Amino acid sequence: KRGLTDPERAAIIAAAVPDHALDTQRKYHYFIQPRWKPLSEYEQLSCYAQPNPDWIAGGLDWGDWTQKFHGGRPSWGNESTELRTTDWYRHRDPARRWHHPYVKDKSEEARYTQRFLAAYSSEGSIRTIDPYWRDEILNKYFGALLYSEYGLFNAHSSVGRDCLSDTIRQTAVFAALDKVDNAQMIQMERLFIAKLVPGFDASTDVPKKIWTTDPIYSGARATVQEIWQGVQDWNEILWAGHAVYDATFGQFARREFFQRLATVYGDTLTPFFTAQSQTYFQTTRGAIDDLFVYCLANDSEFGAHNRTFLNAWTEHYLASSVAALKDFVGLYAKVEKVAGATDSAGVSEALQRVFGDWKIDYADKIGFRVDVDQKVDAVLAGY
Amino acid sequence: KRGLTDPERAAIIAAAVPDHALDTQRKYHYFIQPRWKPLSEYEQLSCYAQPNPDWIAGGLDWGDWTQKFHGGRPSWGNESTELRTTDWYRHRDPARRWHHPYVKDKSEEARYTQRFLAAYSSEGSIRTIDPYWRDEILNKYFGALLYSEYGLFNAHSSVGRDCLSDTIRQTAVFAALDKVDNAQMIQMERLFIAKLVPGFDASTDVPKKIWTTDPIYSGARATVQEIWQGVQDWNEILWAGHAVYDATFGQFARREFFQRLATVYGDTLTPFFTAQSQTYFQTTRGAIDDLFVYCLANDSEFGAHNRTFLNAWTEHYLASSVAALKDFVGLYAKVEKVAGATDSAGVSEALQRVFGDWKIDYADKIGFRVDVDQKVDAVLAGY
Amino acid sequence: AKREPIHDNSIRTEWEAKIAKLTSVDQATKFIQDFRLAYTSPFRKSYDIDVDYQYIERKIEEKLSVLKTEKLPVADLITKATTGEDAAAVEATWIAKIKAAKSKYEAEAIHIEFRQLYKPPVLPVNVFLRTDAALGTVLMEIRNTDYYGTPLEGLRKERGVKVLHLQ
Amino acid sequence: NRAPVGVEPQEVHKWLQSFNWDFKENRTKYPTKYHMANETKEQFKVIAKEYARMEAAKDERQFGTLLDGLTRLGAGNKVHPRWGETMKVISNFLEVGEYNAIAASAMLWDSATAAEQKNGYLAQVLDEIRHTHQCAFINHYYSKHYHDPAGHNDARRTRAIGPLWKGMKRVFADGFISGDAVECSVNLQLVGEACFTNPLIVAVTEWASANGDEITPTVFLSVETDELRHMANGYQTVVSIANDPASAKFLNTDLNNAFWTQQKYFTPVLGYLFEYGSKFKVEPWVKTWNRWVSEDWGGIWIGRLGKYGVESPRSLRDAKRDAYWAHHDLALAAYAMWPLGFARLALPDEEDQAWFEANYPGWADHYGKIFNEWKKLGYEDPKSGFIPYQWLLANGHDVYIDRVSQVPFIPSLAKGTGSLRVHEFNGKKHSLTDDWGERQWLIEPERYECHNVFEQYEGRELSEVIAEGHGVRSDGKTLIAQPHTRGDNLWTLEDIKRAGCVFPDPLAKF
Amino acid sequence: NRAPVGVEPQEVHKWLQSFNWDFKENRTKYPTKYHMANETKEQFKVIAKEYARMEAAKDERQFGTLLDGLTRLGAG
Ligand SMILES: [Fe+3]
Ligand SMILES: [Fe+3]
């Protein structure tokens, strides 16, 4: 007996309802300050969901929390980061992604990937990939790399619990899931290969050993463990992992190494996977950029203040990744020297690109001085 | 004033409705003969929609049509094809695609492609593609090829009007749209390139001229015009275009040429597009195979009969495509000789693969004798 | 008379007993050709098997077609009509007559008979279709010209109908 | 150059026209008196990926509503039984018009020479597949949740039994695919969708929502969204042939033939299904018809084409005459021959009558009297052994089927504008009912040879015909169709059988 | 080996536990009187792509109902 369709009840409710509206403001959370021209739904459903009080920049509640940790650590507090700001809510993901849009998109990628895989196997396209690339490089060092992604995915757990705003929270979480996805997808390619080329061991045993004991991934494992377990300042984890470490080494390993060299050793399978990791990167980038460049590095009251810590973290973590790369360029020794890609100069432009973009993408935006030339030389030493 | 929610009306309808069901058979078109274990929705919503009469194998209606063409050509009739069968409805697309599933999937591909493109440009991944491949080959001969796809797309108009069953109809139409998509997508890559590499002319003028006047695409244009405009037997168009022409030359041009060589000239953009064309191919294949191998070539009463025409068409159209290929292998002359891909042997295994799959995919299924060796030699002569 | 079940009655049964006996392609071609002059089009000889002819025809089409795949060599199936006539010749021929037609009533008969005589499997599918198509355009043009000119009374007489009643 | 850029659909659509290429044999395969221009342009810049994307989105919302919300509401059994039964015929009959359009529009994409023009049709081709599957979904869903799934569960087979099925075939099956592509075009696009479907699909959701049907509005509101591109396809058809000398001669001839074809069935049938297949009336058909046909279409839509030497059909005035009583004439024939259907009918109640007489003064004295007379005779009672068709015969009222349209005709009770002409030709008799189809048949004898239900069923007892054609429900004895919509006293084969109804050749007395 | 094959989510989930790796500092950051076992197993073999796919489907039906059907009904 539902009230909408039951004669006697619908009639009863009909009588109780007023003939006119009791207010005309119909915009859900109309008081949210629009970033763009008019209020978005992404904003309306995200902004102010976190119950912050006025003593936390931006919040609209009042009073202390109702239960803290033993000793008094607040549910959420200003002790979580060294970065200060006028409003923690200021952040807007350029993709305006809320939960729905986010899974909707991935859901497309999910289904499309399985269609593509079923066709590719029927296509027998595997037949022409370089066996060395497949067996030695791809199977081992590409497998190893999943651990870099998985590490970065994990460095987000505390972030998820400790960030001070809803938007940053979602930006943080969708970021993490994209990284565990990368890890999961690298293995998926590994498992697909096993099903096609007999004797191909898709297990993680070798790629696992390589990560933890192979010198090529030594600096990376160092950086990753430090970002993940090393700190708890949620902004420092976010910056170092995405803006520095991944923007450099990760980007170099994926785009400049695996994807690029895949289109030279006749590998038509890997770019399918890297297409996702590379798109995912660019999406997080917009979010990361807004939060740190727009919101933080340029906060009217604390810009210079936050930039002090940003340039600090940048100098520390970049050094870590230069080393990571220097260890990584040892892999080139194991590939066929294609004149202009795997040779000193070829590899040098790969670096040129990486450090060069990072400089315009991140460095210059925060006032960090970097002489791209020196850093390439640095990495190249381990060649 | 709706009857569902209006008190006085809902009440009135409530009284008119009976307390019990007036029949228990609730399966929509339960009399459809399942192919699989139990009736599918793809079957339930597709089967018997076409009002065929008993004088057309399979139909359940009776009598003549109610309006024919001048002179008496039936709305649908047995004069449309030389192939005969026990039931024209027998056909089932392995993908069980009805309209919904079909657009749903493509819709995923649509959106994902635009995400990927926006990232790729931000990725600057274009920087490392071979300029010759990009400017000379891709821009011209890959552009030219859209005309092959567009031709095949068009050879389906009469098919669409003349086939004798609903399932075949849908298989036929989704096939056509996939081909115009290929054409549209090849141009999309061309336009994306223009936006990235200044001076790159993405217009169709050159690729158009090449198709119609460049000897490399001479045999192809010949075959295509003949399949498209040459005949009207809807089964002959379907067979020749998909099972022979595309399965061979098309497949060779896309997978063996453009996609394969893209992963050797360092092109990380093209395989993204070929992934779609290659998946699309495999999907149509299952449908085409069911209709011709399962339904026709193996019809209890007319198998041998239909195979006579199948082997006939096969000998005719294969010869046309061998020639098409022979003209096509002239393109190799314009690429850098990568030891083992663009050289005589490299190209020979490409052929080996093509003719070899076709033999197990189509030939052997219909009783067509083909000596793969001879056909490779044949094509190779124009190298 | 009294009608029998739509899809299974003594008539289709008997003709099937008949069709079954055909064995030569020559044989089958006369049969189907005689069958269509006698039973199809409004200029049919008989209207007796009116509700069964189309099914019967299809059954004859089947017999003929099967016969051709197992007796005529492959080339002929493409290049010629079962009559031993060269398919293009037949096409050339009929497209010539229709163009020579001086009235719509003269045009229609040419089109109608071309079908009775050459509907597949007598003529190849690809050949029959374009010819049928070409003849069709002519008839249509001859016909749709001054379509509402002649009054009903006039049309009735040109058609040669036996007007049994007007309300 | 690292900046987020993609390619927009209109950017792609920019090169479509150059996709086609010349060659001596690049011509349509179908017989036709027209030649569509080669540089004709399309009106909506859609492409494949974009097509899919645009439609799927619609699909998602539709299927969320039916599958999710309405099921939860128990909605499928909240419709009124009359309307629930009418939806068997409305949805399946439409399904065929949607179906044949996939083919018609394919012939059109074949006809067109401009890439862009083929594009618009091809778009229509996909749209038609979608609408066929949508019409099937309505009956499919109704099979699952309605009190009476029989009829909804098998019309694609149970429609072959009765006369009304044949008419629908002429307008929405044969009229879209057999003949000059252009005639097929005017028949489908310019008149079918532009004059009928389009306003119809909206009018149906009104009659539905009003009678507790929320299934139909969910589906059709979706459908109509794609129909605008189709109205455009007809428009482009004229345009592409506007400079063809042929058009000056042929166009208007085909347009009037196409228009009469459509009005013939639609005028009487839809009014009948609305006014009689409903409990809650939304507006009287005679009024609807003048806004659709007389005004919106002849008036506004047609005028926009006048600049192409396109005029109002000469049969428009003749159509107008019929619109008032033709559907009530049909009603008599429909109720009378109810056992040949796949739906449960209901006689106009004491109040339906009042609405009838109010909206059509004169209805009562003529139609009312006969309907009540039948009710007393035992129309709904299976023990009466009474069938209105036999009462028609016993009292001199013969039913004829028009050899061209298939639409039934009872001249003795007809108030519509038609009349009988019985001619003999080459040994065969033919009943024609109006000047336009008589001419059509006189000129194109061989385009019109469709056997009728009497020719097929002659000398057969009605139950035998029904049982053979499967007009029975699960128990194999009880008829799908019924003369009442109550849940008790359902007629069976034995019941029908006791009336001893045998099909006569109505043309044997001439 | 040309046969239509893909990789199922449970196949991937099969290697998840090996994704973690040892190192002296791999411990929780929060204050706690407990230590969760290291080989503890999960109950639903879901993964990223699969998560998204599973939820979106739900989302579609929900939003179709509110946005489409209920609005049409004037339900709010
Ligand atoms: Fe439609
Ligand atoms: Fe339409």
Curated annotation (Swiss-Prot), chains A, B:
Record-level Gene Ontology MF annotations: methane monooxygenase [NAD(P)H] activity
Pfam families: Phenol_Hydrox
Keywords carried by this UniProt record: Monooxygenase, NADP, One-carbon metabolism, Oxidoreductase
Catalytic activity, as annotated: methane + NADH + O2 + H(+) = methanol + NAD(+) + H2O; methane + NADPH + O2 + H(+) = methanol + NADP(+) + H2O
EC code: 1.14.13.25
Protein origin, superkingdom: Bacteria
GO biological process: one example: one-carbon metabolic process
Classification via NCBIfam families: MethMoxAlphaMmoY
Subunit description: M.trichosporium has two forms of methane monooxygenase, a soluble and a membrane-bound type. The soluble type consists of four components (A to D): protein A, comprising three chains, in an alpha-2, beta-2, gamma-2 configuration, is a nonheme iron protein containing an unusual mu-hydroxo bridge structure at its active site and interacts with both oxygen and methane.
Annotated function: Responsible for the initial oxygenation of methane to methanol in methanotrophs. It also catalyzes the monohydroxylation of a variety of unactivated alkenes, alicyclic, aromatic and heterocyclic compounds.
Protein name from the UniProt record: Methane monooxygenase component A beta chain
Organism: Methylosinus trichosporium
Curated annotation (Swiss-Prot), chain C:
Keywords assigned by UniProt, alphabetized: Monooxygenase, NADP, One-carbon metabolism, Oxidoreductase
Catalytic reaction(s) noted: methane + NADH + O2 + H(+) = methanol + NAD(+) + H2O; methane + NADPH + O2 + H(+) = methanol + NADP(+) + H2O
Enzyme class, first EC level, given as a word: oxidoreductase
Keyword NADP (UniProt): yes
One GO BP: methane metabolic process
Any Pfam family: MeMO_Hyd_G
Listed GO MF terms: methane monooxygenase [NAD(P)H] activity
NCBIfam families: MethMoxGammaMmoZ (NF045805)
Stated role: Responsible for the initial oxygenation of methane to methanol in methanotrophs. It also catalyzes the monohydroxylation of a variety of unactivated alkenes, alicyclic, aromatic and heterocyclic compounds.
Subunit architecture: M.trichosporium has two forms of methane monooxygenase, a soluble and a membrane-bound type. The soluble type consists of four components (A to D): protein A, comprising three chains, in an alpha-2, beta-2, gamma-2 configuration, is a nonheme iron protein containing an unusual mu-hydroxo bridge structure at its active site and interacts with both oxygen and methane.
Protein name from the UniProt record: Methane monooxygenase component A gamma chain
Curated annotation (Swiss-Prot), chain E:
Taxonomy, superkingdom: Bacteria
Function field: Responsible for the initial oxygenation of methane to methanol in methanotrophs. It also catalyzes the monohydroxylation of a variety of unactivated alkenes, alicyclic, aromatic and heterocyclic compounds.
Assembly description: M.trichosporium has two forms of methane monooxygenase, a soluble and a membrane-bound type. The soluble type consists of four components (A to D): protein A, comprising three chains, in an alpha-2, beta-2, gamma-2 configuration, is a nonheme iron protein containing an unusual mu-hydroxo bridge structure at its active site and interacts with both oxygen and methane.
Sequence similarity: Belongs to the TmoA/XamoA family.
Name of the protein described by the UniProt record: Methane monooxygenase component A alpha chain
Species this chain originates from: Methylosinus trichosporium
Gene expressing this chain: mmoX
